[PDB]
Amino acid sequence: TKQVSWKLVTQYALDTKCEDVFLLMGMYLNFQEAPAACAACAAADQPNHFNHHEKHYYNAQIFADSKNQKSICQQAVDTVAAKQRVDSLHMTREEMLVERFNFLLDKMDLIFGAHGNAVLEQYMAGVAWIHCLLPQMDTVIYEFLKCIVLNIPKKRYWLFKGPIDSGKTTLAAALLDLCGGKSLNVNMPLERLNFELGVGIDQFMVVFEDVKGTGAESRDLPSGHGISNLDCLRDYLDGSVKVNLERRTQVFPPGIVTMNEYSVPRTLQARFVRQIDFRPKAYLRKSLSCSEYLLEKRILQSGMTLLLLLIWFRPVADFAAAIHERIVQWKERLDLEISMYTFSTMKANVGMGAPILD
Amino acid sequence: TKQVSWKLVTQYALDTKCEDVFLLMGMYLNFQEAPAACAACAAADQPNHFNHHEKHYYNAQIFADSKNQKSICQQAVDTVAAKQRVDSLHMTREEMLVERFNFLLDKMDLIFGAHGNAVLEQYMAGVAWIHCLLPQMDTVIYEFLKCIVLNIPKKRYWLFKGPIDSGKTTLAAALLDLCGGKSLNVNMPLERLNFELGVGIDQFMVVFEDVKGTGAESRDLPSGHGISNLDCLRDYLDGSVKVNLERRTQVFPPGIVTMNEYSVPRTLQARFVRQIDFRPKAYLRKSLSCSEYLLEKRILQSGMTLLLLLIWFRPVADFAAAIHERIVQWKERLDLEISMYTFSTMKANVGMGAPILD
Amino acid sequence: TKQVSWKLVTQYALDTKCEDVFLLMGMYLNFQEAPAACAACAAADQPNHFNHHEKHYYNAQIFADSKNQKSICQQAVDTVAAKQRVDSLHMTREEMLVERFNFLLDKMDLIFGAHGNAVLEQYMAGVAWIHCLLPQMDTVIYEFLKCIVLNIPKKRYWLFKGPIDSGKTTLAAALLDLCGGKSLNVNMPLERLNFELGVGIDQFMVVFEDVKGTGAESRDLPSGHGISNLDCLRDYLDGSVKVNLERRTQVFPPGIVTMNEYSVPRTLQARFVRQIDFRPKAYLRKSLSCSEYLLEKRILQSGMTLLLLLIWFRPVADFAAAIHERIVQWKERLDLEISMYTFSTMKANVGMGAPILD
Amino acid sequence: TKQVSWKLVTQYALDTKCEDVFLLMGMYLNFQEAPAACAACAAADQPNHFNHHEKHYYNAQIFADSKNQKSICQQAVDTVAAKQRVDSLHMTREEMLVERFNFLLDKMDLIFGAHGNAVLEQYMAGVAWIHCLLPQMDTVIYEFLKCIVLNIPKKRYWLFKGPIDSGKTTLAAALLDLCGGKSLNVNMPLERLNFELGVGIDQFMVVFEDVKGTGAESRDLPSGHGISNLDCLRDYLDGSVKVNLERRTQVFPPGIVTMNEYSVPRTLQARFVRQIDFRPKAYLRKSLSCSEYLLEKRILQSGMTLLLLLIWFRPVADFAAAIHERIVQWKERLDLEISMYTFSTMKANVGMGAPILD
Amino acid sequence: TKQVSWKLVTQYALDTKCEDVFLLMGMYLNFQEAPAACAACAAADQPNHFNHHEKHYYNAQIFADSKNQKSICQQAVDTVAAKQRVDSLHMTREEMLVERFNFLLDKMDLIFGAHGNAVLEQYMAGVAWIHCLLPQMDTVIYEFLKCIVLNIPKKRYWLFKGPIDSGKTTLAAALLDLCGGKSLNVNMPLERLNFELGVGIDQFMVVFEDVKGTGAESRDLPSGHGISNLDCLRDYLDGSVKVNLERRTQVFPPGIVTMNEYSVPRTLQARFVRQIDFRPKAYLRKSLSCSEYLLEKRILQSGMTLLLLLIWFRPVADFAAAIHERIVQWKERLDLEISMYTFSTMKANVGMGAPILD
Ligand SMILES: c1ccc(Oc2ncccc2-c2nc3ccncc3s2)cc1
Ligand SMILES: c1ccc(Oc2ncccc2-c2nc3ccncc3s2)cc1
Ligand SMILES: c1ccc(Oc2ncccc2-c2nc3ccncc3s2)cc1
Ligand SMILES: c1ccc(Oc2ncccc2-c2nc3ccncc3s2)cc1
Ligand SMILES: c1ccc(Oc2ncccc2-c2nc3ccncc3s2)cc1
Ligand SMILES: [Zn+2]
Ligand SMILES: [Zn+2]
Ligand SMILES: [Zn+2]
Ligand SMILES: [Zn+2]
Ligand SMILES: [Zn+2]
């Protein structure tokens, strides 16, 4: 009998950055049918499927007859975690952000392409709104990325502080996506916290989302163990030394802490290089109600939007040389659909609390 | 010696959407006896058995001699979870509702068919009662389905609020079945909650059934951690971002929250696009007591009844093209047994608190 | 077919002191490509890769085709833990410190070498600052190392006591790195403590980092179970007998306890042979702000810096004979870049709170 | 291909009483190199290595190529636990103490031999100090050993009661080592206690080290669940019946309970056949400060010292016939280095709080 | 190569009623040496070894070379648990007591035989003391055995109530041994209790040893959850129905409950068919102090002593026909060493608080 090439199954896992055994099992199996008569190949909308179907068709036919499908898939997913551990130690943080930028760019190529469905002018309308949320937003995003790549101790955490629906969550969400980090919850007690800080292992950045304080109940704010728990994690936030995470020994990743208006202890405040104070501007919310497509299509919280922001505002030099061809081609695509004159118009419509696109 | 085709066992699992190793083991084994002399084949009431017996008879004879039955079955059930992960990412939410609609329709074909036992006029009597429970109920159900398919953030949760035996539970039950979601319990403390929110992984929708509040004990209402727990799950309900579920990383599924008359916090209230206030109407309960067959046959809480409601009221265009032939044939079946004139009569009998069928 | 030499995979694990299955899996796999056309070989910056690529190229080609990659890697990592248990019993504590010194020295050879990026004069600037933090710092570090090697009961624990940003943490961090120990947390309750003291198994030294007391809340100090927990661990700290650790039976390793200004019980105070009282000197902090490169490059907390301190100040006799050639060559490298005259100048700039390097 | 003799790996485990899989893996592996060119063989200081290297050289060469090293080692360690269970039932308690005495004697042969480093006159200086700690100390140690071998119910527990640094801990430590028992902690709550009493399975004796009471906080004594927990363990201490230990069903082993000056309940006091009241004598501590080598070399708490005490004081008849040749030869070794006249001088120096050796 | 007969290893496990994998591993291994030159065979004191050595010598030689020793032993121990489950359902309770009686009798044959060490007149001295503890003690023991065999609901529990050192514990211990039951602890909270009641699965009888009450602290009695926990276990004690034990579904075994003088609730008191009130008689304790050999040799708490009591007092008819030959021969052995005249003398010495044997 024939024998499955585990190495080739493993190749696909690597090529698609598959961290899911089950997803790899069903994804590989869909490759057993003939590509010449394949509808998902004809549709050309799942690159993880149409770019790989011809390469894995015979191997997937063998795989379909295996008694050992999960075991083959476990080794593959394990090779992915292995490749990840290698890079977390071998790769420079700039090399890691380029790798992330390519991910968003591949996704962008697809959804804004021939077989995609997303509308670029809608995302550009989003870029405008985002650029209206803070003064020098292009520099605000750029300084954050630099902050994360450099990852300098006591100078790698940004605190987002504002009330509900003031942009803080959305910016944190969008920045987390742009970097490709993970979101943490520190409102649980010290006991369960150690396994939750483990979600930080081999991560480029992290966002401690919606950190809650105490005694602020008199202000319609929930009491939580967040600020106290974070106050303890001095070694984590500072990143002067390597911490001992459980779920590895490494410098805890840099990122963002988001919270409502709670009192920050003197000690926890000293842990932030930067504090942005988000406040609700009536014009921003009115415009969004008038531009419903943004919320409906989850555009604002997207890293693609923030990559698009940066592609629009920054020269090719402001990006890594390994991705100059990509940026350059995306700059021409933007030029086609939008001009600096019409981009300022978009922002003007935001100030007027009016629909961003006319 | 002969060797079992795991692929063919796996095929059956897929074909019947089997998520149970034990059920697949006993189901496959029943196929070892000769179909020509099979009583369950002659009875033709278990489609999962009579549609598959001829295809798996020789393989099941081999399977019956295997030392590795659970392992063969585990791979099959695993292929099912795999196929599920693939779709949760690849399939459109409309494609997922059609897949569900076909499930209810296959069940309907059977129980209302030659070998079935359920009485269609009894289910139609149920459709009437359901249509009497709310103004524009056809549009109420239709708007919910659209809500779920579109799955728009801050605009994907419906709150059902009413006292005991006022229709809220039954509608939620029936809608949950129609969509094929799961039911959750948030009255437990924050600690056990995380594994319970895991019941949400790869689900089309969810119903947080019987959410309890506090201090309402003075009103014969039980105290519970429900409303507070839900108040914390802002990121879950809104679905603006991907949450981290444990039992996957995904947008938490949309659905319904059901509760008795408890005070809803300003923050938890802002999470609902729609709030339906169920109140006990004497005529509805009297009619049901007069129509005992509905409760006895679990007709009201059935998605089949709500599919039947929609087949009765909506034109073929209001359904997906992939299921037009099915709807069309079911429309002719309804025409045979019921007329618009007699359907209004059914509703008239409900208003009179009288037996729905005469 | 060909068969992987597990012994050779195991060899690499030993040679690189790999305690990580995943890291060994991805590290071995990177050896499958041809060394002659290998970019990581041409770059010559990952010694764990370029020193081993030619030796493991054919074996890694076989490994790449294995179905048993994790199992092969588990045996290797297990041989490492085995080799560690052997030494913890067979090796003299001086032999263990030399082994550690070689580790820092190999790292130093690389980062200060042809393919390295670190700047030696920056680390030397760090040596200066460190030597300004305490009187007779060379003798302070030297006495600690002797303390650890000798590991004499009731005379093997040093207590670092000072406020935030006074050098205590940094010295403890740097000394921990120089020895190659682990850091512990005793602020958790007695229950979870036993598994945390397990982090001490087969360790040369340990640092109980940031031990918290009680009632000192009136002084902006957090309440913690640290001092009480440590007060109980008399048998641990003294090291007169073998304790029973869980995660082995051994003398608990010696080291440091660091704490803010909290009251030390009479009994816990008797457990320390030495107590250094760190106090914030304005000139030290001003100079560091003026020398940002130190903090940015994590130089102060490095054992490499403290090895460099000792290489600068101590004659070849003050080190073990097994590493005389290394010390001697590093002494010539330092002579080239720095003189005693310019080293005193560096210290003079520290006293002036001025940039250490001119 | 060649095949490893598991039986021979198992033999080595038995021969060295190896209860550690990892230690056996690294210990066996060190035997793969040629004994003729082996430095650890030439050094002749690790009997577990030099006595076995020639016997396991070829088998270790095979072992080095095995894919199944941990499994081979697990069976070996399991044979050790098996051999232990056999003896705990088959061996007489005198046979078990001889087996222990041989262990200390083999260790003594080595460290006081050609390749050893320990100084016998230093240990003899220790014997003196120990003999000064209690009247008729030779008879005190002898009566304890008899107590343990006979293991008579309600007459097998000795309570050591004294303040910090009064000899109680050291005697308990030394006696525990002489017998080869284990140390227990009963200051934890009843819940975790059952698994901790499991440390007692197949043990010759146990020491409940540093048992704490309550309300004695007014006397600078820590509150603990020790005395109460022990008060419950009537069936354990008495040893009239077989208890049900969890980690076996057996009589709980006899031994010592050590505590500071806390009130002993009437019921817990009735459980002790003997109570020795240790009190700090200024001369004993002064002499020890003057003889630093004792503390530094962990001589006092050693069973070797107490075996040496007994070899010095007791005639060959006072020991088991199976070890008469060993005792006799050790008696000649002592005669060479020490006389009764100079031993009394050592004790005289203790009374004077002066260095024991002149 | 040769292959081990697992069936024969399994045979030995059955033959010796081995419930311990490790004990079976070391016990089987001791059979590898030649019986003709075997010292344990020549000694003839371990029947589990000398009766089986010749039968398992060749198989044990094969076993010694196995890689699969624990697995072979696990199947054997499993066959024992299997044989036990079979009997718990198939065997009559009289058949189970005979099986137990044979166990004590085999042990008696050995220790009172040619190679034994126990002195029969010492055990007979014990029989006397035991017969002095209660009026009609032969009938008291006999009625208990009948009680246990019949196992009639609400009429199968005996409550032993008395203070410390009044005979209650010793009688319960001795009766538990005679029946071959297990001892339980109900002083723990309801949570851990369910796994502890699991110790009752496939048991002939159980003793809830030292059950503690509350509020009796004013009487130097410890507070405990015993009496309350037992009060809940109505279905357990009564044995009218089958309970659901966890560690099986069966009637919970009958036995004894022992407690100090605590108040028994009306409901818990109704659960006892019999209550014996043990009180300290000065003559009984004085005699025991005068007969130290009894306590030292654990004679009183032995089932062998109570079997010996019954062999002395009861005619052959009072025992099961399957063991008449054994009883008859033991009756002749007793006749040889003791007469009714000298047995009454023994009892007379007990009343006088004098040494039982003259
Ligand atoms: C409904 C509910 C909420 C809405 O607002 C938003 N929803 C989703 C994401 C962001 C926003 C807003 N961001 C800002 C930032 C600054 N000033 C005001 C706002 S509002 C809009 C409609
Ligand atoms: C016994 C117990 C309960 C009953 O009522 C029901 N039982 C089962 C399901 C639903 C209902 C009702 N729904 C409504 C909705 C609106 N007004 C009144 C009702 S009563 C009927 C009989
Ligand atoms: C910002 C934040 C903190 C800073 O100080 C430091 N940071 C990192 C590591 C060490 C220090 C200091 N060590 C000492 C020792 C003695 N006197 C004063 C100091 S300050 C400097 C800038
Ligand atoms: C430092 C710290 C403690 C010291 O004492 C000791 N250390 C280690 C072990 C034992 C002792 C002592 N044993 C006794 C017994 C009776 N009277 C006095 C003592 S002191 C000595 C120096
Ligand atoms: C020491 C400690 C205790 C002792 O008594 C005992 N020891 C062990 C087992 C039983 C007893 C006793 N049983 C009874 C029964 C009735 N009256 C008095 C007693 S005394 C004897 C010595
Ligand atoms: Zn395709
Ligand atoms: Zn059939
Ligand atoms: Zn290379
Ligand atoms: Zn050697
Ligand atoms: Zn024998």
Quickly list DSSP for B170-209.
HHHHHHHHHHT-EEE---S-HHHHHHHGGGGTT-S-EEEE
Q: Strand runs (DSSP E) across chain C, as ranges?
A: 157-161, 182-184, 206-211, 243-244, 249-250, 255-259, 274-277
Query: Distances in Å between the alpha carbon of C318 and those of C131, C232, C315?
Result: 18, 37, 6
Distance of CA C122 to the CA centre of its chain: 19
Tokens for A89, please give them. 């130690």
With CA atoms as reference, report the closest residue to C237 among C220, C216, C219, C252: C252
Residues of D in contact with E77 (CB under 8 A): none
Q: Strand runs (DSSP E) across A60-185, as ranges?
A: 157-161, 182-184
Note whether D173 contacts C241, CB cutoff 8 Å.
yes
- Give buried/exposed letters for B186-212 (b at 16+ CB in 10 A, else e): bbeeeeebbebbeebbbbbbbbbbbbb
The domain limits of chain A are 1-91, 92-132+281-357, 133-280
Using CA atoms of A281, A284, A288, A290 in order, give the dihedral in degrees to the nearest 10: 100
Residues of A in CB contact (< 8 Å) with C are 6-7, 71-72, 75, 78-79, 81-86, 89-90, 150, 152-154, 190-191, 231-232, 234-235, 240-241, 244, 266-267
CA distance, residue D79 to nearest chain E CA (Å)? 7
CA distance, residue A192 to nearest chain B CA (Å)? 9
Query: Distances in Å between the alpha carbon of D228 and those of D184, D214, E1, E19?
Result: 15, 9, 60, 34
Q: Is E341 exposed, middle or buried (0-12, 13-18, 19+ CB in 10 A)?
A: exposed
Query: Distances in Å between the alpha carbon of D229 and those of C108, C316, D189, D215, D219?
Result: 55, 57, 8, 16, 21
List, in sequence order, every residue forming a beta bridge with C249; answer none if it has no partner: C244
- The residue with tokens 């060993």 is D326
Task: Name the 3-class secondary structure at C233.
Answer: coil
Task: Name the 3-class secondary structure at A350.
Answer: helix
Task: Name the 3-class secondary structure at B212.
Answer: coil
With CA atoms as reference, report the closest residue to D140 among D165, D171, D164, D161: D171
With CA atoms as reference, report the closest residue to B140 among B103, B174, B116, B91: B174
- How far apart are the CA of B302 and the centre of ligand 7, in A? 29
| Residue B158 DSSP one-character state | E
| Ligand 1 site-directed mutation target among A133, A283, A288, A305, most atoms within 8 Å of CB | A288
Angle at E144 between CA E140 and CA E147, to 5 degrees: 140
Q: Is A167 exposed, middle or buried (0-12, 13-18, 19+ CB in 10 A)?
A: buried
Neighbours of D130 (CB within 10 A): 26
How far, in Å, CA of B182 to CA of B173, rounded? 10
| Ligand 3 site-directed mutation target among C131, C166, C285, C295, most atoms within 8 Å of CB | C285
Taking each helix axis as running N to C, give the angle between helix E21-29 and helix E69-90, from 0 to 180 degrees, rounded to the nearest 10.
120
Note whether E22 contacts D241, CB cutoff 8 Å.
no
The set of residues, in sequence order, having a beta carbon less than 8 Å from that of E113 and lying 6+ positions away, is none
- Whether residue B115 is annotated as binding a ligand: the answer is no
Q: Which residues surround ligand 10, an ion (CB under 5 A)?
A: E 35, 38, 40-41, 53
3-state helix, strand, coil in chain B (%, to 5): 60, 10, 35
- Whether residue C162 is annotated as binding a ligand: the answer is yes
How far, in Å, CA of E187 to CA of E208, rounded? 10
Using CA atoms of A241, A247, A253, A257 in order, give the dihedral in degrees to the nearest 10: -110
With CA atoms as reference, report the closest residue to A185 among E57, D42, B243: B243
| Residue D253 DSSP one-character state | P
Angle at B320 between CA B315 and CA B325, to 5 degrees: 70
| Residue B243 DSSP one-character state | E
Fold designation for C1-91: Arc Repressor Mutant, subunit A (1.10.10)
Query: Distances in Å between the alpha carbon of C286 and those of C292, C355, E24?
Result: 10, 9, 73
Tokens for A60, please give them. 């997937």
Helices (H), A17-52: 21-29, 39-43, 47-50
Contact of chains A and E by CB distance (3 or more pairs under 8 angstroms): no
Fold designation for D133-280: Rossmann fold (3.40.50)
CATH number of this structure's domain C92-132+281-357, picked from the four choices 3.40.50.720, 1.20.1050.70, 3.40.50.300, 3.10.580.10: 1.20.1050.70
Distance of CA E325 to the CA centre of its chain: 22
How far, in Å, CA of D80 to CA of D77, rounded? 5
Using CA atoms of B44, B48, B50, B55 in order, give the dihedral in degrees to the nearest 10: 170
How far, in Å, CA of A207 to CA of A212, rounded? 14
Rg for chain E, CA atoms, rounded: 23
Task: Name the 3-class secondary structure at C325.
Answer: helix
Tokens for B77, please give them. 């059930």
Neighbours of D315 (CB within 10 A): 8
User: Of all helices (H) and strands (E), which one includes residue D182?
Assistant: strand D182-184
Tokens for C7, please give them. 């012994």
**Which residues form ligand 3's pocket by a CB distance below 6 Å?**
A 154; C 133, 165-167, 170, 280-281, 284-285, 288-289, 295, 300
- The residue with tokens 């309300």 is D215
How far, in Å, CA of A72 to CA of E284, rounded? 74
- Whether residue A225 is annotated as binding a ligand: the answer is no
Backbone phi and psi for residue A249, each to the nearest 5 degrees, phi listed first: -125, 115
How far, in Å, CA of D327 to CA of D105, rounded? 9
C118 in Cβ contact with C126 (< 8 Å)? no
Name the closest residue on chain C to residue A5, using Cα atoms.
C65
Query: Distances in Å between the alpha carbon of A314 and those of A317, A324, A328?
Result: 8, 12, 11
Ligand 1: which residue has its CA nearest to atom 3?
A: A165
How far, in Å, CA of A245 to CA of E102, rounded? 59
E344: left (phi over 0), alpha (psi -120 to 50) or beta: alpha
How far, in Å, CA of D335 to CA of D124, rounded? 11
Give me the residue from B72, B78, B150 closest to A25, CB to CB. Answer: B78
CA distance, residue E88 to nearest chain D CA (Å)? 21
Topology match between the domains A1-91 and A92-132+281-357: no
Tokens for B71, please give them. 């392992």
- How far apart are the CA of E138 and the centre of ligand 5, in A? 20
Tokens for D315, please give them. 């005639």
